[PDB]
């Protein structure tokens, strides 16, 4: 999976460096289907993440954004 996409392969390198730096990432997509695929990848490399897309209900939005902002364990949104 991570090598069948050139972007994904390059994102992997960059996220490893970002993590080791203690950076926290908003990661933006134009396709929610891709948001799903990735969701997997992130599980494999075992990084903590949130999700907010047009499916995410309004008070759940508030909740998720507040998390990302409250609890620094989450690395990617």
């Amino acid at each position: 999976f991570v090598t069948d996409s050139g972007k994904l392969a390059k994102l992997d390198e960059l996220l490893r460096e970002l993590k080791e730096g203690g950076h926290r990432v908003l990661l933006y997509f134009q396709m929610t289907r891709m948001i799903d695929l990735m969701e997997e990848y992130l599980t494999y490399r075992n990084y903590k993440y949130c999700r907010l897309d047009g499916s995410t209900k309004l008070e759940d939005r508030r909740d998720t954004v507040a998390d990302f902002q409250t609890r620094p364990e989450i690395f990617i949104f």
Binding site: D4, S5, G6, K7, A9, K10, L14
Partner: protein
Amino acid sequence: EVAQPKLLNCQLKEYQLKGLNWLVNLYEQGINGILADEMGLGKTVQSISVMAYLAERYDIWGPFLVVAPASTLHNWQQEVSKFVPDFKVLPYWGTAADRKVLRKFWDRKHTTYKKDSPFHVMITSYQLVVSDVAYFQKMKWQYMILDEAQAIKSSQSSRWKCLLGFHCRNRLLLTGTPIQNNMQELWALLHFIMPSLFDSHDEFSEWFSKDIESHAQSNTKLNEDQLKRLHMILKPFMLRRVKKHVQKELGDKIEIDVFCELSYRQRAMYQSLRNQI
């Protein structure tokens, strides 16, 4: 050089007070205006400010209509409540039933409201403005703010169609992006603001757009004199201010293009796509 409307239970920053002025003049002289401060400079407070000024001096207390994105209504309602405590806001969102009751607050007989009215500012979404346009069209509005005015960037949008047909003296668009995409979408706003002076998109194209759109799209020469003449035409109707002048404290962004070649599978798919032509 006006004074912070005294009905305003806060103090404006410098630029909001210069921006107040602009909107006070754009009224005295009949003009409308886009307030296009770059995103995050405090556009809401300047709008509420104009409305409060109106009241204090001209004793015109209503009705004012704020249309906004649905997501933003509570923020608007709270901001109005904070900055002009005396302003009775009427929320106008809710199920059909909720809205039906609220419609009973609309005084259609008084042309101009005074302090003890049912309501002063009505706050409502673009979606409602369009579904309930039947109702909104009967009312006659003393001022109107569209916030996140990029919502009516298309002249073919039902949203622009509806809102253009509202009887209102005064419109104030708020949007930090008058243009995004074509310049067409700037004509849309200009026509909404002042349909007299920008009465024809085609003229607009011929005289300004096709030059500027070719200078970007095909790297032609930019006609300096034409461009200056456009700015001129825009200048009394659009105010834009930028963070580097008024929110100086933030450090800059670093942008990095990160380049990737297709993997094998990607390529063999890309090329079947190309061969399907």
